[PDB]
Design an enzyme around this catalytic site. Structure first.
Site, PDB file in Angstrom:
ATOM      1  N   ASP A   1       2.645  -8.696  -0.309  1.00 56.88           N
ATOM      2  CA  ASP A   1       1.672  -7.633  -0.138  1.00 56.88           C
ATOM      3  C   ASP A   1       2.245  -6.687   0.882  1.00 56.88           C
ATOM      4  O   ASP A   1       1.966  -6.839   2.040  1.00 56.88           O
ATOM      5  CB  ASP A   1       0.449  -8.121   0.563  1.00 56.88           C
TER       6      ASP A   1
ATOM      7  N   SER B   1       4.868  12.077  -1.621  1.00 60.14           N
ATOM      8  CA  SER B   1       5.336  12.402  -2.820  1.00 60.14           C
ATOM      9  C   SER B   1       5.421  13.824  -2.820  1.00 60.14           C
ATOM     10  O   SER B   1       4.681  14.473  -2.278  1.00 60.14           O
ATOM     11  CB  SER B   1       4.338  11.625  -3.865  1.00 60.14           C
TER      12      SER B   1
END
Length: 330
Positions: free
Chosen positions: A35, A199
């Site tokens: 994770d 992004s």
């Protein structure tokens, strides 16, 4: 040193991925959920409330000659999806894919919430976010990666998740045969303890690319892709019959649909998520309404590049003094 381990979807939908981990002496092998959105290595154990164990493999520290109770240490964690666990702490030898850490904090669960109990395939979690998020008290503990870092050939790990198929986590090296073209690297903020990056925009299907900054985290422990409501609306508008359902808890679409791809920007580069990756199947057995793999982050408080996005790429988690993230197509 290096390590290399295969990671395997837990079910036919890729809801999560499990990776075998050796704990203790003799080894006890548990299948953990790696994770990159948390920083605790915790396991089902001989100390876990018996009614809260249902099929998991447990760690039994009393059977490990290298286990030592970390006196006074406790832990307690709550995840973004509302699940939780807590317990006490041992140090022990932990190996992943041939890479061994001695004195790793192994957090032994005394209590786990129902979603963990109900998932027989996940024996615990192995956190790979920054150690500042680790919940051990009163002495915060380091992640497996942080403990291994100095011994690694290079201070990196990579995530290569498969679509309906096994993949690989590597530690300490970049497998140049595992991706096509080049790796594009992008800046990371550790201010919130996550692999947080920006992004450069998105496209829907064969649509034109929209240049726009989207701050989010690379999180192997989250199943889906969670993005701003504007972006998600633009995606599902291209699917006939798709709608957001409060009763189901997100966007659903007719199972008869052909989903468009979704592209996200990494610097000047582009990662394409095929439409099939965004299908998470009937909302209930036999239903013709299917659950979407791209969902709104509104009310999460953060955008999450979960498995839907990451499995479309070869991803480098670069833990150099100034950390960065790398993405390649594959």
């Amino acid at each position: 040193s290096t390590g290399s381990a295969t990671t395997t979807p837990i079910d036919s939908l890729d809801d999560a991925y499990i990776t075998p981990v050796q704990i203790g002496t003799p080894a006890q092998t548990l299948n953990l959920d790696f994770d990159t959105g948390s920083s605790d290595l915790w396991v089902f154990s001989s100390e876990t409330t018996a009614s809260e164990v249902d099929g998991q493999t447990i760690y039994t520290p009393s059977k490990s000659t290298t286990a030592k109770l970390l006196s006074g240490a406790t832990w307690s964690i709550s995840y973004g999806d509302g699940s939780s666990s807590s317990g006490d702490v041992y140090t022990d030898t932990v190996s992943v894919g041939g890479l061994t850490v001695t004195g790793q904090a192994v957090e032994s669960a005394k209590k786990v919430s129902s979603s963990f109990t109900e998932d027989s395939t996940i024996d615990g979690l192995l956190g790979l976010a920054f150690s500042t998020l680790n919940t051990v008290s009163p002495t915060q503990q380091k992640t497996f990666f942080d403990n291994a870092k100095a011994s690694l050939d290079s201070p990196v790990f990579t995530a290569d998740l498969g679509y309906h198929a096994p993949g690989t986590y590597n530690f300490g090296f970049i497998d140049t045969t595992a991706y096509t073209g080049s790796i594009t690297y992008t800046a990371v903020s550790t201010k919130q303890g996550f692999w947080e990056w920006t992004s450069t925009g998105y496209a829907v299907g064969s649509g034109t690319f929209k240049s726009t900054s989207i701050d989010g985290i690379a999180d192997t422990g989250t199943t889906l892709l969670y993005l701003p409501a504007t972006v998600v609306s633009a995606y599902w508008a291209q699917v006939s019959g798709a709608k957001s359902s409060s009763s189901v808890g997100g966007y659903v679409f007719p199972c008869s649909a052909t989903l468009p791809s979704f592209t996200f920007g990494v610097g000047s580069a582009r990662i394409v998520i095929p439409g099939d990756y965004i299908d998470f199947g009937p909302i209930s057995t036999g239903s013709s309404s299917c659950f979407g793999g791209i969902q709104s982050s509104a009310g999460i408080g953060i955008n999450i590049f979960g498995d839907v996005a990451l499995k479309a790429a070869f991803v480098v988690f670069n833990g150099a003094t100034t950390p960065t993230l790398g993405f390649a197509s594959k």
